[PDB]
Amino acid sequence: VLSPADKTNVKAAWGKVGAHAGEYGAEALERMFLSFPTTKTYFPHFDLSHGSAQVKGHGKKVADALTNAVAHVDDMPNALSALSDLHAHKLRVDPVNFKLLSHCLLVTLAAHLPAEFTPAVHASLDKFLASVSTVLTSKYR
Amino acid sequence: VLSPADKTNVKAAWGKVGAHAGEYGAEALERMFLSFPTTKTYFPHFDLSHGSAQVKGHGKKVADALTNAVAHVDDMPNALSALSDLHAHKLRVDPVNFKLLSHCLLVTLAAHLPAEFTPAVHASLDKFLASVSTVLTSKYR
Amino acid sequence: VHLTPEEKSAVTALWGKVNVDEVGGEALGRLLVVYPWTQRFFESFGDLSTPDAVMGNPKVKAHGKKVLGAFSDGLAHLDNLKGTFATLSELHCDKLHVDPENFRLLGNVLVGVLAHHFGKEFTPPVQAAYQKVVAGVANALAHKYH
Amino acid sequence: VHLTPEEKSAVTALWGKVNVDEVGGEALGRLLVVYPWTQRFFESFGDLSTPDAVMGNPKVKAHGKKVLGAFSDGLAHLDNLKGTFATLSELHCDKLHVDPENFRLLGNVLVGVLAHHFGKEFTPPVQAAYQKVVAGVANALAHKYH
Ligand code: HEM
Ligand code: HEM
Ligand code: HEM
Ligand code: HEM
């Protein structure tokens, strides 16, 4: 579960992301396609070229779903309801894959938040990405 | 989430384990150390040889724990509060090992319940063990 | 894969008694009931909304027998899992878009099925030799991914 | 491991700028904070009660530099990590009883660290190259488990 401090810590790092979310989000996805190339099996109908509009848009959608979760940290299931349904019933993405993106996102924040990515901010972020992943996977079966 | 049918399927199945629960516990540990050798890393103090009374008695404790899990299917976090503090703050077993025992445990049930190990029954049990694993690993961080 | 004389003997002996038709089918069906998300690759297969439905569907049975039959040839070429499955690895990657994690999930349900089928005869040591086989097949398959 | 010439040069060049001891201590320190169950091996290092305690601990730091120097000598032998890490692998299994998952944990915490240290120089392709190196090492360290 997320402790009080965890929430303060996400809300702080994320605030800092500010307007770049969409950009960060696109960077994460490309980090993932390069690192874990099996994750591409889920995007066969995307142009996964670098700078592709497809990747940049989806990047922005991802980041928006994250800001929202950040906004409704005390109520994620609710806040992501529509999203867990989609991933569960439509995309049917194997739960392993959520670890992979979370990792890639964490690397993305690291590279862009020198001053803020303290060991404790890092732990709280790792946890929140775990919870986001658990909420999104919860209706799979 | 455990649906009323999953609950019914679990009670049902576990009920046929009956008195063999401990016996099945041990066999599960056993399949576990031979299948996934890395898990032995946590019992360097046990005689892991076949017939080992330490395995046997450990098998029995696990089993009894699952029994108590079944009995309290609606309030597992409470019923397993002590086990979760233990695995998390003392043993500190990597979460990834909960999956490996859960599999060896499904495997043992299958091999002993040729009639009740229906595909449906197979899914409610795996649901059940993944929740039990979730509970035990909920206080790690 | 590397298996002790003991392990090959146990793998192969159990395999001689497996009905590739019945087992393939059970294995595939149980994949789709236990981990429903895998149903995304078989959109064009029939009703898959019920365990009865899955388990009773001719297309699933059909597929199962083909998977197992493929698996069977790996067994026979335990020494060269990679070279044996390279073509099907490329198939599943470039044409099918199957996340190789599914290989794993299948490898596990197969163990479960042999266990259910064989009971006692599927002993800890026998399980272990099969756990290795399936892991090997799942890696020979994920091998051409890129 | 399996690295194109370009990937090797990439790995080799950033590495040239790492302060081994500093990063070593950071990664290890970060491991103990992010994934606290890893602390189980380090009870004789003393206070690990807070993130500050962990990061400030001379024992963690000293342990970090030893782990990172070995990793570092590893790079010289990308061609044969299994060769290079065989004894150590034997040690973590037989005498330390370190579950090879921890290695996978450190590998990723390490990547996080490189990313935080180098920022923008840590591009998506630099990350990929590193991700192969770290999975290769963790594999090589787990090969003699039994
Ligand atoms: C925290 C993790 C994730 C979040 C917040 C997330 C969020 C989203 C959102 C908001 C959408 C689109 C909804 C709309 O169109 O507005 C979506 C779609 C999608 N996601 Fe996820 N997602 C996550 C993880 C994953 C992972 C791990 C994968 C697979 C590797 C995945 C694959 C997909 C695909 C293929 C689509 C549809 C793309 C298209 O065809 O438009 N997602 N996700
Ligand atoms: C549902 C899964 C599990 C259940 C129900 C369970 C239950 C138990 C119980 C009842 C105890 C003894 C506590 C006491 O005597 O107060 C125990 C201890 C222990 N467990 Fe677990 N356990 C689970 C999973 C794990 C896993 C996956 C591992 C590692 C591979 C693990 C490693 C240990 C060890 C090392 C101990 C202490 C053994 C000794 O030194 O006496 N457990 N567990
Ligand atoms: C694990 C070992 C596997 C083996 C050896 C294997 C082998 C095969 C074979 C031999 C074919 C058909 C080509 C022919 O008709 O000769 C095939 C097709 C296929 N496989 Fe795999 N398979 C495996 C697992 C999987 C898994 C886990 C999935 C996803 C659940 C999958 C998805 C597919 C699909 C969708 C097709 C084509 C179906 C169609 O065209 O109707 N396979 N596979
Ligand atoms: C690439 C990953 C790693 C490498 C290269 C590595 C390397 C080393 C080396 C070189 C030593 C000392 C060898 C000797 O005294 O002969 C060692 C000791 C040790 N390592 Fe590892 N290590 C790794 C990961 C880890 C992890 C992740 C853990 C636990 C979370 C760990 C736990 C230990 C412990 C407890 C010792 C003994 C410390 C002592 O007795 O002073 N190692 N490691």
PDB file of N, CA and C in Angstrom, chain B residues 37-42 44 88 90-97 140-141, chain D residues 34-37 39-40 43 92-93 97-102 105 145-146:
ATOM      1  N   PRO B  37      15.418 -24.713  -8.098  1.00  0.00           N
ATOM      2  CA  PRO B  37      16.518 -24.842  -7.116  1.00  0.00           C
ATOM      3  C   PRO B  37      16.917 -23.619  -6.318  1.00  0.00           C
ATOM      4  N   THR B  38      16.656 -22.417  -6.856  1.00  0.00           N
ATOM      5  CA  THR B  38      16.949 -21.156  -6.244  1.00  0.00           C
ATOM      6  C   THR B  38      16.207 -20.996  -4.964  1.00  0.00           C
ATOM      7  N   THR B  39      15.041 -21.570  -4.831  1.00  0.00           N
ATOM      8  CA  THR B  39      14.200 -21.464  -3.648  1.00  0.00           C
ATOM      9  C   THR B  39      14.923 -22.187  -2.455  1.00  0.00           C
ATOM     10  N   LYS B  40      15.875 -22.985  -2.744  1.00  0.00           N
ATOM     11  CA  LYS B  40      16.569 -23.764  -1.615  1.00  0.00           C
ATOM     12  C   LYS B  40      17.418 -22.802  -0.783  1.00  0.00           C
ATOM     13  N   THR B  41      17.736 -21.667  -1.430  1.00  0.00           N
ATOM     14  CA  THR B  41      18.544 -20.592  -0.904  1.00  0.00           C
ATOM     15  C   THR B  41      17.954 -20.102   0.413  1.00  0.00           C
ATOM     16  N   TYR B  42      16.674 -20.362   0.620  1.00  0.00           N
ATOM     17  CA  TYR B  42      16.014 -19.839   1.817  1.00  0.00           C
ATOM     18  C   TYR B  42      16.006 -20.947   2.926  1.00  0.00           C
ATOM     19  N   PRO B  44      18.779 -23.096   3.873  1.00  0.00           N
ATOM     20  CA  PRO B  44      20.141 -23.694   3.952  1.00  0.00           C
ATOM     21  C   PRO B  44      20.372 -24.430   5.285  1.00  0.00           C
ATOM     22  N   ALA B  88       7.688 -10.728   5.477  1.00  0.00           N
ATOM     23  CA  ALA B  88       8.104  -9.383   5.093  1.00  0.00           C
ATOM     24  C   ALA B  88       9.233  -8.774   5.920  1.00  0.00           C
ATOM     25  N   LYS B  90      11.088 -10.463   8.699  1.00  0.00           N
ATOM     26  CA  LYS B  90      12.050 -11.440   9.157  1.00  0.00           C
ATOM     27  C   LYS B  90      12.638 -12.311   8.072  1.00  0.00           C
ATOM     28  N   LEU B  91      11.851 -13.119   7.399  1.00  0.00           N
ATOM     29  CA  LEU B  91      12.310 -14.007   6.324  1.00  0.00           C
ATOM     30  C   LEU B  91      12.770 -13.218   5.115  1.00  0.00           C
ATOM     31  N   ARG B  92      11.895 -12.267   4.710  1.00  0.00           N
ATOM     32  CA  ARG B  92      12.317 -11.397   3.584  1.00  0.00           C
ATOM     33  C   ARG B  92      12.573 -12.174   2.299  1.00  0.00           C
ATOM     34  N   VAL B  93      11.622 -13.082   2.067  1.00  0.00           N
ATOM     35  CA  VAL B  93      11.651 -13.928   0.848  1.00  0.00           C
ATOM     36  C   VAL B  93      11.262 -13.008  -0.339  1.00  0.00           C
ATOM     37  N   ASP B  94      11.997 -13.086  -1.404  1.00  0.00           N
ATOM     38  CA  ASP B  94      11.660 -12.292  -2.611  1.00  0.00           C
ATOM     39  C   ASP B  94      10.245 -12.672  -3.034  1.00  0.00           C
ATOM     40  N   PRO B  95       9.418 -11.702  -3.355  1.00  0.00           N
ATOM     41  CA  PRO B  95       8.065 -11.958  -3.885  1.00  0.00           C
ATOM     42  C   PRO B  95       8.011 -12.973  -5.007  1.00  0.00           C
ATOM     43  N   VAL B  96       8.988 -13.078  -5.859  1.00  0.00           N
ATOM     44  CA  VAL B  96       8.974 -13.971  -7.006  1.00  0.00           C
ATOM     45  C   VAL B  96       8.900 -15.467  -6.696  1.00  0.00           C
ATOM     46  N   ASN B  97       9.155 -15.738  -5.386  1.00  0.00           N
ATOM     47  CA  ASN B  97       9.131 -17.165  -4.974  1.00  0.00           C
ATOM     48  C   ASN B  97       7.703 -17.558  -4.651  1.00  0.00           C
ATOM     49  N   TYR B 140       5.609  -5.783   2.506  1.00  0.00           N
ATOM     50  CA  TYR B 140       7.038  -5.747   2.229  1.00  0.00           C
ATOM     51  C   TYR B 140       7.589  -4.358   2.187  1.00  0.00           C
ATOM     52  N   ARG B 141       6.818  -3.368   1.740  1.00  0.00           N
ATOM     53  CA  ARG B 141       7.432  -2.023   1.557  1.00  0.00           C
ATOM     54  C   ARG B 141       6.345  -0.983   1.632  1.00  0.00           C
TER      55      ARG B 141
ATOM     56  N   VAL D  34      14.934   0.617  -1.921  1.00  0.00           N
ATOM     57  CA  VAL D  34      13.735   0.464  -2.818  1.00  0.00           C
ATOM     58  C   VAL D  34      13.075  -0.868  -2.568  1.00  0.00           C
ATOM     59  N   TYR D  35      13.922  -1.881  -2.392  1.00  0.00           N
ATOM     60  CA  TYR D  35      13.561  -3.278  -2.151  1.00  0.00           C
ATOM     61  C   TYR D  35      14.239  -3.776  -0.807  1.00  0.00           C
ATOM     62  N   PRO D  36      13.658  -3.323   0.261  1.00  0.00           N
ATOM     63  CA  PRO D  36      14.166  -3.561   1.613  1.00  0.00           C
ATOM     64  C   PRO D  36      14.342  -5.006   2.058  1.00  0.00           C
ATOM     65  N   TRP D  37      13.731  -5.965   1.412  1.00  0.00           N
ATOM     66  CA  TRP D  37      13.885  -7.379   1.750  1.00  0.00           C
ATOM     67  C   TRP D  37      15.322  -7.732   1.437  1.00  0.00           C
ATOM     68  N   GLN D  39      17.909  -6.384   2.414  1.00  0.00           N
ATOM     69  CA  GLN D  39      18.634  -6.020   3.643  1.00  0.00           C
ATOM     70  C   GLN D  39      18.937  -7.285   4.457  1.00  0.00           C
ATOM     71  N   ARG D  40      18.159  -8.313   4.276  1.00  0.00           N
ATOM     72  CA  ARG D  40      18.278  -9.603   4.940  1.00  0.00           C
ATOM     73  C   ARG D  40      19.730 -10.125   4.963  1.00  0.00           C
ATOM     74  N   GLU D  43      22.387  -7.560   7.802  1.00  0.00           N
ATOM     75  CA  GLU D  43      22.148  -7.287   9.239  1.00  0.00           C
ATOM     76  C   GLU D  43      23.421  -7.011  10.045  1.00  0.00           C
ATOM     77  N   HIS D  92      27.843 -17.381  -4.271  1.00  0.00           N
ATOM     78  CA  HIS D  92      26.542 -16.818  -3.827  1.00  0.00           C
ATOM     79  C   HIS D  92      25.464 -17.877  -3.546  1.00  0.00           C
ATOM     80  N   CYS D  93      25.707 -19.006  -4.133  1.00  0.00           N
ATOM     81  CA  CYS D  93      24.822 -20.182  -4.031  1.00  0.00           C
ATOM     82  C   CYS D  93      25.184 -21.034  -2.788  1.00  0.00           C
ATOM     83  N   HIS D  97      23.993 -18.121  -0.234  1.00  0.00           N
ATOM     84  CA  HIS D  97      22.529 -18.373  -0.331  1.00  0.00           C
ATOM     85  C   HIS D  97      21.770 -17.065  -0.695  1.00  0.00           C
ATOM     86  N   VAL D  98      22.358 -16.468  -1.739  1.00  0.00           N
ATOM     87  CA  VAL D  98      21.684 -15.229  -2.322  1.00  0.00           C
ATOM     88  C   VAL D  98      20.785 -15.697  -3.501  1.00  0.00           C
ATOM     89  N   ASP D  99      19.512 -15.565  -3.358  1.00  0.00           N
ATOM     90  CA  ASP D  99      18.488 -15.870  -4.411  1.00  0.00           C
ATOM     91  C   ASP D  99      18.860 -15.032  -5.659  1.00  0.00           C
ATOM     92  N   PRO D 100      19.137 -15.652  -6.787  1.00  0.00           N
ATOM     93  CA  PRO D 100      19.507 -14.920  -7.998  1.00  0.00           C
ATOM     94  C   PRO D 100      18.523 -13.820  -8.427  1.00  0.00           C
ATOM     95  N   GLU D 101      17.371 -13.679  -7.922  1.00  0.00           N
ATOM     96  CA  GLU D 101      16.450 -12.542  -8.188  1.00  0.00           C
ATOM     97  C   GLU D 101      17.077 -11.218  -7.780  1.00  0.00           C
ATOM     98  N   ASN D 102      17.668 -11.152  -6.567  1.00  0.00           N
ATOM     99  CA  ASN D 102      18.433  -9.985  -6.134  1.00  0.00           C
ATOM    100  C   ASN D 102      19.363  -9.377  -7.188  1.00  0.00           C
ATOM    101  N   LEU D 105      17.231  -7.530  -9.493  1.00  0.00           N
ATOM    102  CA  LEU D 105      16.997  -6.253  -8.801  1.00  0.00           C
ATOM    103  C   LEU D 105      18.122  -5.257  -8.892  1.00  0.00           C
ATOM    104  N   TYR D 145      24.015 -22.146  -9.823  1.00  0.00           N
ATOM    105  CA  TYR D 145      23.019 -22.444  -8.785  1.00  0.00           C
ATOM    106  C   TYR D 145      22.624 -23.916  -9.014  1.00  0.00           C
ATOM    107  N   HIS D 146      22.247 -24.643  -8.011  1.00  0.00           N
ATOM    108  CA  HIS D 146      21.909 -26.065  -8.028  1.00  0.00           C
ATOM    109  C   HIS D 146      21.152 -26.462  -6.758  1.00  0.00           C
TER     110      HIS D 146
END
